[PDB]
Design a protein around this ligand. Structure first.
Ligand SMILES: *[C@@H]1O[C@H](CO)[C@@H](O)[C@H](O)[C@H]1NC(C)=O
Ligand SMILES: *[C@@H]1O[C@H](CO)[C@@H](O)[C@H](O)[C@H]1NC(C)=O
Ligand SMILES: *[C@@H]1O[C@H](CO)[C@@H](O)[C@H](O)[C@H]1NC(C)=O
Ligand SMILES: *[C@@H]1O[C@H](CO)[C@@H](O)[C@H](O)[C@H]1NC(C)=O
Ligand SMILES: *[C@@H]1O[C@H](CO)[C@@H](O)[C@H](O)[C@H]1NC(C)=O
Lengths: 367, 342, 49, 269, 269, 49
């Protein structure tokens, strides 16, 4: 049941910043980051195969990894993905890690193999989830608007995506030859070993047994265990099958995207007061939220800003009304009026203050 | 979003390999001579002196393009449509007609034709870009002329096409000493960058309070201009003047008047009706508006009407059942400066 | 080098354009129209049958 | 596909609002992951019809089995990875007279609200060579010697029981309409309802205004179609299609809506 | 459910013109309906491997039987309405010694160019008690008394042979493209070729300008696509689909188009 | 031919238009049958004669 990884090998790579001051050759080396979700989850291309045994079983508590031409087995609870904290791991399959993780400028992975060592390595990754709606926040709220967004689903056998798996080229190991005072002792360790020498007699060819090669040193020669019986995928950190283009293979990359609906927090409803012709408004923010306003006349006169602290601002309402929105909630309309005091039908002149209320700055000009 | 597929580098040991023109969008190849890569056991090939590295790279479409994408549309002219509620014969009827002037809809034998819009104003320009909910007026670069790192750096005609146009300024650099990897230069994404310096959408900046929704894209409640409406009312709805009650010697007293948005005018009209029946009360002066359509007259009783006006001293004539009544009112300014409804 | 030219809208008529870049031999480009398509706005008002 | 639930003919007058009832406790889902992926396996003990079943041991998906009696600890055992291949078998380390009775292996899906059970009769004898497990026609019978272990096999290889992906995301309600004259397969889709909240209306805007579903549809499992201002263009054969593809529920209900008949009409089913 | 005809991979160089071969003599048809509903029945008589066969009787669909021997006229009879129920049995009024041999019943449809035949060996005895009908393993053998009538049954009730609408009107050839990495069924429609001659192309102008089939494609039964100025968007899995829904012909050819190997290409299969 | 379509062939960039004349043979209202189009002021929807 979903076993297409039957002939791949969880290859070992070169990780370019393994911590502790310097890079290393490591099995854990991540290669490709996926961050195309809006909501803020991460999909990771790693150099391993997780949940599959050496006999290609559905043992979903172990993991395969290469070390020194050995596919060995460790266990699934040792993984730690981190940027600034332990990220919440969600989906583990093969070369594929799905996790959710807070704000951070890096990304590292690390875990304990079968020889109790936490191999860790990192990359720089400027991870920042984008804002949703109009709000910067912390946690998933009680109640909010339901906006469209995108996330990765945990299905496995999804087609319409491909990578090409193939034959590994070679692996040079200088842990084989020993100098017998001019000779070398090429071992084979039950494999197929290529040698190449600056040494007469046996200079070229392919050996299958242990050899003793006369009158020429270790560094005078070459030793490389030539695998043929399994598959690695084309990594940009691995040398090619060094003759031509890639041998054809087929691995679909699982956990595809989908639309989804996600909750965004509502605003806190602010407190308003009404002055002569214009409005005043104190806002109650708790996480940084933007606020915008326009009018509905000919021009928009559009203004906006983000706010973090509680502010009291004034806004001039014209005769064509005003519109202000704040948070995810409903846009507040407002409309002016024929004021609290003017000057009614009175024995003095007592119209002109009234004749400011309708039409300020004009029609006193015809007076 | 684009995806830069960089395959395994072709390491040509002690000889010089040459890459040929293999047609792919933004196809990049560079052969670096004198490279000395270090592997597990030292240099990967024994023949050390003349090694060269063939670096190959190409850009292709991401799978996310099927879900996450922005579309550039050309908007030219809009077909207007309106929903009208009519209190016809004491009942609320809803009609839905195209506000273009050539869509007659007959409901309960009453033919409705909303005319053409007096103003042809539209808040949308010729070029629109849509990302699911928000739409933007943006002068996107033409197809096949995109610039690197900006909106339109990667362009395809449809989400399922196979050929695509790309301008990402990908130039391959010489790899570092010993480490086997494929370095490549700067490659920012214009689509992923546009999502940050996007600015306010048209939903917030459009004048006249237009509310815009999508799926399909539409502008709702743009308060611009006026609209002509023609009603071909059938003849069964009408009643002759003689069949309607005759009312006479009507007088009006206004105990309270406030020129405001709310029900600020109250008028008590004393009348004498000849018989029982319905009547259409109507103000003949447009500066004052009555918010009641039908009144039941009985005889020597009184009716109460609510009116709204902007004039402080409203001297106006009201025609009820073809009979004229003069009403003289004086109205005071209200207490509140801001109402939330126009 | 960007060359801007204007040709009349006549199909089946070959037009010659002279590209004169300083320091290079002049180049003549031959232009031939095949078809000019005008796709109008399709908004179905109604059907009759 | 789908399975026919119930037929009715609906005759209503012009100007009224039709409400085509389509409710099912099996299409309920909520806009929160209210432990839908949580299943429970449990073994129960009874002693005939005149005894009370007792929950012995249960186990949540992605969890460890919990036994209720301290005496039975380390004695009644399940495979800790039971949910990988669906082998819910129970091994009794050492049996006594108090274990005699009918054991039921019960699988339960808290989201699908399905229960499945099998029975085994346990009787404790003294001779180990008479100890056997056989099928009496409807249940397994275990004869076990005192102090011997008893492995009662309970294997269910259905995909819902093994640790596959098991969250569908695409529970869906379809409202379909069959107009007069249109052949099958070419019926127009009226409404799409996804469990996630998405709704899709089809047709010109003048038609979309008249077709609606209640806003808490998946919250109550009520997807009843309300069409206001019944017109003759509302007549036809409507079908509500409930599809829960992963759990294998595929049902449809058929409503014959005709608007040509006053208040004298008799109801069907 | 389409039967594969032949499968190949085609690799050609960029800048060249692709020719995607799709040929079939069984798809030949012309604009006219010139005797499309024409079938023929014919009975043949043979006498072992070392004698020459003679056509005895033939008959066109909706027509009357033609006899070649004047003595056998009004003696060898088929049902004049044989084509309505597929009862092509032959009644011979009176048998003689010269009639011994193997008779073959042949049905042929000129539009699908199908032929189907079965043999029955007739042997004429003198004693009626030796008369039997048996199946020797691959053909019926009829033993008939001299002068008796013989009903040689030939019944084929397949829809192509019975008298029913029997008018095609919609054979279609499809050219499909499955893009690299893109899975099947959501493949872009490239070309529709209708038996009437009409073709339907889909897509932007960059694709439509390069895809064509010769105008007498179905006339010659050669549907090879010639694509000028090969672009990378042409690479992929092409499928030519011949669909004759009525005659039960549903065939496709599949092409893996790769761009490599200018003159060094191995032509697959 | 709108002035909004750059096409690159053999590294040569071709951009064509926009058309100097905005004239069109179609009026605002047209009626189309099987293969024929007519310039006709058809009656509006719900007001037929
Ligand atoms: C999600 O919905 C949007 C809305 O049209 C659509 O474009 C996208 O393809 C959908 N994705 C999936 C996986 O259904
Ligand atoms: C018509 O609708 C308006 C909306 O508020 C309401 O005030 C009025 O009572 C309605 N008339 C009838 C007859 O229902
Ligand atoms: C089921 O589990 C029991 C242990 O509880 C084990 O002995 C048995 O072999 C398992 N069945 C299969 C088919 O593996
Ligand atoms: C075929 O037709 C003959 C008469 O021509 C009739 O006797 C015979 O019964 C028919 N066959 C069947 C199966 O009915
Ligand atoms: C031809 O017939 C098909 C199906 O009957 C129809 O969809 C199409 O519109 C018709 N085309 C013309 C030009 O009549």
């Amino acid at each position: 049941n979903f076993n297409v990884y039957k002939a791949t090998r969880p290859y070992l790579a070169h990780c370019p910043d393994c911590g502790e001051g310097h890079s290393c050759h490591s099995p854990i080396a991540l290669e490709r980051i996926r961050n195309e979700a809006t909501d803020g989850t991460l999909k990771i291309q790693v150099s391993l195969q997780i949940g599959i045994k050496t006999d290609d079983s559905h043992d979903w508590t172990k993991l395969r990894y290469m070390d020194s031409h050995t596919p060995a087995d460790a266990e699934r609870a040792g993984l730690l993905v981190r940027t600034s904290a332990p990220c919440t791991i969600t989906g583990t399959m093969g070369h594929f890690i799905l996790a959710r993780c807070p704000k951070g400028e890096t990304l590292t992975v690390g875990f304990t193999d079968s020889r109790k060592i936490s191999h860790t390595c990192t990359h720089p990754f400027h991870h920042e989830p984008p804002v949703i709606g109009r709000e910067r926040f912390h946690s998933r709220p009680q109640h909010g608007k339901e906006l469209p967004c995108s996330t990765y689903v945990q299905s496995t056998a999804a087609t319409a995506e491909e990578i090409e798996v193939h034959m590994p080229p070679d692996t040079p190991d200088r842990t084989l030859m020993t100098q017998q005072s001019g000779n070398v002792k090429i071992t084979v360790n039950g494999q197929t070993v290529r040698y190449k020498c600056n040494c007469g007699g046996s200079n070229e060819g392919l050996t299958t047994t242990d050899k003793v090669i006369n009158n020429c040193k270790i560094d005078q020669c070459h030793a490389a265990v030539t695998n043929h019986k399994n598959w690695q995928y084309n990594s940009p950190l691995v040398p090619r099958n060094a003759e031509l283009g890639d041998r054809k293979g087929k691995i679909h990359i699982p956990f595809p995207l989908a639309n989804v609906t996600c909750r965004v927090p509502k605003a806190r409803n602010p407190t308003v007061t009404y002055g002569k012709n214009q409005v005043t408004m104190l806002l109650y923010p708790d996480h940084p939220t933007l606020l915008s306003y326009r009018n509905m006349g000919q021009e928009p006169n559009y203004h906006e800003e983000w706010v973090t602290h509680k502010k009291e601002v004034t806004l001039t309402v014209p005769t064509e009304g005003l519109e202000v929105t704040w948070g995810n909630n409903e846009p507040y309309k407002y409309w002016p009026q024929m004021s609290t005091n003017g000057t009614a039908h009175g024995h003095p002149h007592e119209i002109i203050l009234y004749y400011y209320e309708l039409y300020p700055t004009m029609t006193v000009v015809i007076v | 979003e684009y995806k830069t597929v960089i395959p395994s580098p072709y390491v040509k040991c002690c000889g010089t390999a040459e890459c040929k023109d293999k047609s792919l969008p933004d196809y990049s190849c560079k052969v670096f001579t004198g490279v000395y890569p270090f592997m597990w056991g030292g240099a990967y090939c024994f023949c050390d002196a003349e090694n060269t590295q063939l670096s190959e790279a190409h850009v292709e479409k991401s799978e996310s393009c099927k879900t996450e994408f922005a579309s550039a549309y050309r908007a030219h002219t809009a077909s207007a449509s309106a929903k009208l509620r009519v209190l016809y014969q004491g009942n609320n009827i809803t009609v839905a007609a195209y506000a273009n002037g050539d869509h007659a809809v007959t409901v309960k034998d009453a033919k409705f034709v909303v005319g053409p819009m007096s103003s042809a104003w539209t808040p949308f320009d010729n070029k629109i870009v849509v990302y699911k909910g928000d739409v933007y007026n943006m002068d996107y670069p033409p197809f096949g002329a995109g610039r690197p790192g900006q909106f339109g750096d990667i362009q395809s005609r449809t989400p399922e096409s196979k050929d695509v146009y790309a301008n990402t300024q990908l130039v391959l650099q010489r790899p570092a000493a010993g480490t086997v990897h494929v370095p490549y230069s700067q490659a920012p994404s214009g689509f992923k960058y546009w999502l940050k310096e996007r600015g306010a959408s048209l939903q917030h900046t459009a004048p006249f309070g237009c509310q815009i929704a999508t799926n399909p894209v539409r502008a709702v409640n743009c308060a611009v201009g006026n609209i002509p409406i023609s009603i071909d009312i059938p003849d069964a709805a009408f009643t002759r003047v003689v069949d309607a009650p005759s009312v006479t010697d009507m007088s009006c007293e206004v105990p309270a008047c406030t020129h405001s948005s709310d029900f600020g005018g109250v008028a008590i009209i004393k009348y004498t009706a000849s018989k029982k029946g319905k009547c259409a009360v109507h103000s003949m002066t447009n500066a004052v508006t009555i918010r009641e359509a039908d009144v039941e007259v009985e005889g020597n009783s009184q009716l109460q009407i609510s009116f709204s006006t902007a004039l402080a001293s409203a001297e106006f004539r009201v025609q009820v059942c073809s009979t004229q009544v003069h009403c003289a009112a004086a109205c005071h300014p209200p207490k509140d400066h801001i109402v939330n409804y126009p | 080098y960007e060359h801007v030219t204007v040709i009349p809208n006549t199909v089946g008529v070959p037009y010659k354009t002279l590209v004169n870049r300083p320091g290079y031999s002049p180049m003549v480009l031959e232009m031939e129209l095949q078809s000019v398509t005008l796709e109008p706005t399709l908004s179905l008002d109604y059907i009759t049958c | 596909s789908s399975s026919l639930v119930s037929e009715s003919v609906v005759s209503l007058a012009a100007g009224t609002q039709a409400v085509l009832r389509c409710q099912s406790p099996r299409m309920v889902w909520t806009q929160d992951r209210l432990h839908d992926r949580q299943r429970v396996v449990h073994w129960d003990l009874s002693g005939g019809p005149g005894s009370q079943r007792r929950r012995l041991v249960d186990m949540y998906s992605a969890g460890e089995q919990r036994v209720y009696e301290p005496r039975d600890r380390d004695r009644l055992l399940l495979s800790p990875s039971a949910f990988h291949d669906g082998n819910f078998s129970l091994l009794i380390r050492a049996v006594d007279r108090g274990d005699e009775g009918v054991y039921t292996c019960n699988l339960h899906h808290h989201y699908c609200h399905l229960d499945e059970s099998l029975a085994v009769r346990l009787e404790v004898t003294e001779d180990p060579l008479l100890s056997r497990a056989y099928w009496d026609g409807e249940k397994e019978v275990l004869v076990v010697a005192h102090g011997a272990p008893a492995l009662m096999t309970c294997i269910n290889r259905a995909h819902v029981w093994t640790d596959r992906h098991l969250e569908e995301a695409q529970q869906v309600v379809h409202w379909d309409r069959q107009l007069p004259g249109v052949s099958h397969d070419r019926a127009d889709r009226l409404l799409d309802l996804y469990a996630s909240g998405e709704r899709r209306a089809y047709g010109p805007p003048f038609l979309r205004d008249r077709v609606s579903v209640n806003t808490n549809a998946f919250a109550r499992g009520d997807f009843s179609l309300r069409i206001d201002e019944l017109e003759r263009a509302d007549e036809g054969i409507y079908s509500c299609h409930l599809h829960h593809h992963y759990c294998g529920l595929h049902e449809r209900r058929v409503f014959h809506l005709q608007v040509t008949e006053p208040a004298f009409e008799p109801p069907s089913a």
